[PDB]
Design an enzyme around this catalytic site. Structure first.
Site, PDB file in Angstrom:
ATOM      1  N   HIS A   1      25.678  31.264  76.865  1.00  0.00           N
ATOM      2  CA  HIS A   1      26.526  32.230  76.141  1.00  0.00           C
ATOM      3  C   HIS A   1      25.711  32.749  74.971  1.00  0.00           C
ATOM      4  CE1 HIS A   1      28.117  28.698  73.747  1.00  0.00           C
ATOM      5  NE2 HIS A   1      27.647  29.529  72.662  1.00  0.00           N
TER       6      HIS A   1
ATOM      7  N   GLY B   1      27.713  28.425  65.290  1.00  0.00           N
ATOM      8  CA  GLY B   1      26.058  27.825  65.359  1.00  0.00           C
ATOM      9  C   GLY B   1      26.086  26.475  65.534  1.00  0.00           C
TER      10      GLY B   1
ATOM     11  N   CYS C   1      27.236  24.989  68.630  1.00  0.00           N
ATOM     12  CA  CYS C   1      26.946  25.177  70.096  1.00  0.00           C
ATOM     13  C   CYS C   1      25.388  24.721  70.457  1.00  0.00           C
ATOM     14  CB  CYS C   1      27.135  26.538  70.762  1.00  0.00           C
ATOM     15  SG  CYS C   1      28.780  27.040  70.231  1.00  0.00           S
TER      16      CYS C   1
HETATM   17  C1  LIG Z   1      28.635  28.219  68.805  1.00  0.00           C
HETATM   18  C2  LIG Z   1      29.371  29.132  69.097  1.00  0.00           C
HETATM   19  C3  LIG Z   1      30.478  29.631  68.520  1.00  0.00           C
HETATM   20  O1  LIG Z   1      30.421  29.753  67.268  1.00  0.00           O
HETATM   21  N1  LIG Z   1      31.875  29.973  69.005  1.00  0.00           N
HETATM   22  C4  LIG Z   1      31.937  30.883  70.301  1.00  0.00           C
HETATM   23  C5  LIG Z   1      32.275  30.555  71.682  1.00  0.00           C
HETATM   24  C6  LIG Z   1      31.859  31.788  72.329  1.00  0.00           C
HETATM   25  C7  LIG Z   1      32.417  32.017  73.675  1.00  0.00           C
HETATM   26  C8  LIG Z   1      32.559  30.827  74.416  1.00  0.00           C
HETATM   27  C9  LIG Z   1      33.397  32.945  73.760  1.00  0.00           C
HETATM   28  C10 LIG Z   1      31.051  33.060  74.446  1.00  0.00           C
HETATM   29  O2  LIG Z   1      31.341  32.434  71.497  1.00  0.00           O
HETATM   30  N2  LIG Z   1      31.470  32.172  70.203  1.00  0.00           N
HETATM   31  C11 LIG Z   1      33.046  29.525  68.595  1.00  0.00           C
HETATM   32  C12 LIG Z   1      34.165  29.630  69.761  1.00  0.00           C
HETATM   33  O3  LIG Z   1      34.437  28.713  70.585  1.00  0.00           O
HETATM   34  N3  LIG Z   1      34.927  30.671  69.396  1.00  0.00           N
HETATM   35  C13 LIG Z   1      36.020  31.113  70.484  1.00  0.00           C
HETATM   36  C14 LIG Z   1      36.070  32.720  70.161  1.00  0.00           C
HETATM   37  C15 LIG Z   1      37.389  30.486  69.821  1.00  0.00           C
HETATM   38  C16 LIG Z   1      35.779  30.980  71.703  1.00  0.00           C
HETATM   39  C17 LIG Z   1      33.239  28.085  67.845  1.00  0.00           C
HETATM   40  C18 LIG Z   1      33.645  27.667  66.749  1.00  0.00           C
HETATM   41  C19 LIG Z   1      33.641  26.430  66.088  1.00  0.00           C
HETATM   42  C20 LIG Z   1      32.750  25.445  67.102  1.00  0.00           C
HETATM   43  N4  LIG Z   1      32.515  25.867  68.033  1.00  0.00           N
HETATM   44  C21 LIG Z   1      32.489  27.039  68.641  1.00  0.00           C
END
Ligand SMILES: *CCC(=O)N(c1cc(C(C)(C)C)on1)[C@@H](C(=O)NC(C)(C)C)c1cccnc1
Ligand SMILES: *CCC(=O)N(c1cc(C(C)(C)C)on1)[C@@H](C(=O)NC(C)(C)C)c1cccnc1
Lengths: 304, 304
Positions: free
Chosen positions: B41, B143, B145
């Site tokens: 991602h 960030g 991930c």
């Molecule tokens: C590290 C990536 C990130 O900030 N997140 C994230 C996940 C995603 C996908 C799986 C939707 C592609 O995009 N950005 C956060 C996250 O999981 N956000 C969602 C929109 C709730 C899925 C994230 C925030 C805090 C901790 N880990 C990830």
């Protein structure tokens, strides 16, 4: 989101951990530049541990009696000195993995990471707080002595604690890296009782602020209070008296959450007077006091 | 004595953490030999995150679109492949700090250390458990991930977890290092709810055994029970069904303490039915289920 009892990455401190043997006694040592720091009770036999005259015990010892082992290579000791309750063994090699480092003496309530070591080999890392009675509730066995507590400011390791002994009460006592014990504790096998283990009020409020940020808000009420009024309830519940300094330090958390410090004090006051009623804040059934305001700001803002 | 939520020393894993940028998206990568592992991602814009066709998004990308930075030196990407939900970027340099390592897929209830990273820089380390609903209750921001969960067998790092996303419920989902997600979770911004977060029964019993060893014995009663009888109460309290395998695994703790596994089950049964009554076991007001029988044996015997 999510809040965890985080320790600093131990890598920089792992590279400073060595095995110090004196006779039958083996424990951990901290190798920074061309000096190895360890507890002075390495020179003690089980006979000595009761009433040891360290200066007299130390006369019997020479440079060659101190066996320093880094990994599986032996370091040459070219000088030994006693500073308070720690031994400083000068070696002929400067630790090639010596980081930027300081020797700081922390105040009670201040938190630090501990790398628990055995025979100079790190076994685990956990986060800790210097209890208001100058004890720490660590996880230490025999041969853990010399295991150090530290804080990292980006790339600079502030060494605050060296582990020396466990009190008959099961809690732990140790020194700063100048060999000065935290609290009234002496490196003797004698009747030493810890004082009242009061709760670090400012740390609890920071952790309540951490709970609000991460979406655990059930405990937020409609009340405020005053420092004087809150402190009456804190006294009753063996909590540390909250000062204007503590309020100022919580200012950033107060600003970010939009909750006044004394409104959060009022929520805490009610939790003391009512309990949790079988509920949990950040997956804890008691009020956590081993997160500083700085720890919460750091963990919530992702400082590397 | 003393029992702490211990993480493995992170040093070996710190040396494998790199920064992977693809467009505006920066996250953490694991550099082992001449391969950098990161969540797939990284290639997604905020537009893509809803319904991304990763194979189609990946066609647009080349080796030079993936910016890998170790410390403050740039690594040359000479090949990229997608394995399930992780990207494998081949670099021209083998990580000089690559430890002995394995890629293991852990079972629910199994514990591991997490090194939380931001821009390839480790910020903190905490101990974790793969929840029976295949979530983890980590501390992760944006960030984070690419931050990995690991176990160490002396000098060999078994990488079990890579962090991918936080569910709208505030808990965390991720993959093994073959890119296969734990549980039914997909790397999409969609309605994904975790199952019942049941308590890891075997882990609680191990932690009760840990309490007895460290001198917290108030909860020990005069009763025993049977697997079938205990499991009726466990079911009611959303605890995992206890098996003969779990009893066998607790055998060592049973032997050392001289307390039969089913006698400790009877003590747990009473704690479920009665609660703590405002008391604490190992300074916890709820029953801790993020210590494996192996974790307790390790911490209590001082394995390095
Ligand atoms: C590290 C990536 C990130 O900030 N997140 C994230 C996940 C995603 C996908 C799986 C939707 C592609 O995009 N950005 C956060 C996250 O999981 N956000 C969602 C929109 C709730 C899925 C994230 C925030 C805090 C901790 N880990 C990830
Ligand atoms: C690492 C040294 C050790 O095993 N202990 C110890 C302390 C002492 C002195 C202070 C009496 C010289 O000798 N051996 C343990 C300890 O504190 N034992 C006493 C006898 C209760 C003081 C110790 C055990 C567990 C954790 N840390 C230290």
């Amino acid at each position: 989101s999510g809040f965890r009892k985080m320790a600093f990455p131990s890598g920089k401190v792992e590279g400073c951990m060595v095995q110090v043997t004196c006779g039958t006694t083996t424990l951990n040592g901290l190798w920074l530049d061309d000096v190895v720091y360890c507890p002075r009770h390495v020179i003690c036999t089980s006979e000595d541990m009761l009433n040891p005259n360290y200066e007299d015990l130390l006369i019997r010892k020479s440079n060659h009696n101190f066996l320093v082992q880094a990994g599986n290579v032996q370091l040459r000791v070219i000088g030994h000195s006693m500073q308070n309750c720690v031994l400083k063994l000068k070696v002929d090699t400067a630790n090639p993995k010596t980081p930027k480092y300081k020797f700081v003496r922390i105040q009670p309530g201040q938190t630090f990471s501990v790398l628990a070591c055995y025979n100079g080999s790190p076994s685990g890392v956990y986060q800790c707080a210097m209890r208001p009675n100058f004890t720490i509730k660590g996880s230490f066995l025999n041969g853990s002595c010399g295991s150090v507590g530290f804080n990292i400011d980006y790339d600079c390791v502030s060494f605050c604690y060296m582990h020396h002994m466990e009190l008959p009460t099961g809690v732990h006592a140790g020194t700063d890296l100048e060999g000065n014990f935290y609290g009234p504790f002496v490196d003797r096998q004698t009747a030493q009782a810890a004082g009242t283990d009061t709760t670090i009020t400012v740390n609890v409020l920071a952790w309540l602020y951490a709970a609000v940020i991460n979406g655990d808000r059930w405990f937020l009420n409609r009340f405020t209070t005053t420092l004087n009024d809150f402190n009456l309830v804190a006294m009753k519940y063996n909590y540390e008296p909250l000062t204007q300094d503590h309020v100022d330090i919580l200012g950033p958390l107060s600003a970010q959450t939009g909750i006044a410090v004394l409104d959060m004090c009022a929520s805490l006051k009610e939790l003391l007077q009512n309990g949790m009623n079988g509920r949990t804040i950040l997956g804890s059934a008691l009020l956590e006091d081993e997160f500083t305001p700085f720890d919460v700001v750091r963990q919530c803002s992702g400082v590397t």
